[PDB]
């Protein structure tokens, strides 16, 4: 299942989804980073290549592994790179994901879980990319090391939403 995360703001699933809707609407990021989610180096490279373009970014981690970090590595990404939101695709089902996510919510970060697998047709992921597109998304930044599945999906996404795709 997927988890979308935003940092704490001065400002349940239904209300929570609307808060993320409002966020993407106000932020209007120009880039989305697609990375595997294990190597921080890879995410670091792609983030730099986004600031270099003066693009605000969302991060999409396609093959995220929880390890023993309890999502502390996602929090560190907010701090170090200033991503407006982070999406992680996990091997967990929704109920376990919502459960595991409780730890990051304890720190003020808002997190919303929805069902799905990275390889499968996902309408919620389409809703996110579409809304990003509607609000000004310009480019997909493919970090080094992506699987051919994600690379191919990214190219189709660039074609669908009329985006530049950067490697």
């Amino acid at each position, epitope marked *: 299942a997927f988890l979308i995360v935003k940092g704490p703001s001065e400002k349940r699933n239904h209300e929570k989804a609307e808060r993320f809707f409002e966020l993407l609407v106000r932020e209007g990021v120009e880039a989305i980073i697609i990375a595997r989610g294990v190597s921080e180096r890879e995410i670091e490279q792609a983030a730099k290549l986004a600031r270099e373009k003066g693009f605000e970014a969302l991060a999409f981690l396609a093959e995220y592994e929880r390890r023993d970090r309890q999502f502390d590595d996602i929090i560190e990404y907010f701090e170090r790179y200033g991503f407006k939101a982070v999406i992680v695709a996990t091997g967990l089902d929704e109920k376990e994901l919502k459960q595991a996510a409780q730890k990051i919510e304890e720190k003020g970060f808002k997190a919303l879980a929805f069902s799905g697998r990275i390889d499968q047709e996902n309408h919620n992921i389409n809703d996110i990319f579409e*809304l990003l597109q509607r609000q000004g998304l310009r480019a997909i930044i493919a970090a080094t090391g992506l699987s051919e599945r994600e690379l191919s999906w990214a190219q189709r996404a660039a074609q669908q939403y009329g985006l530049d795709i950067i490697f």
Partner: nanobody
Amino acid sequence: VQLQESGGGLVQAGGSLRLSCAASGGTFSTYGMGWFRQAPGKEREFVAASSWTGANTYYADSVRGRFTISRDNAKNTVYLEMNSLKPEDTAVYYCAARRWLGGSYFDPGNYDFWGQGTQVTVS
């Protein structure tokens, strides 16, 4: 959210018919708009659905090629253009609203708001 269908009626096989559904409510609550249909004795089933921008549209296999969904967001109206109508297409057609990030467009349980239905009869 408030929804209201129009455009239903009687048509001959091979004939065309255009459905309209006027929606009130915001972009979040009506991000996805869909058409479902129900014949007597049968379950309400998915027909066609569109995202807000139309960049994602979904169709029942029984219906693609023949039916085309579209939206006029300025009026928050959704249309279903039905061509090459078949008698098996006879049913009450309902429009429905699915909030942003509401899950699969195919599943009627993901639509929180429903219209009152418009009868479509193909003889």
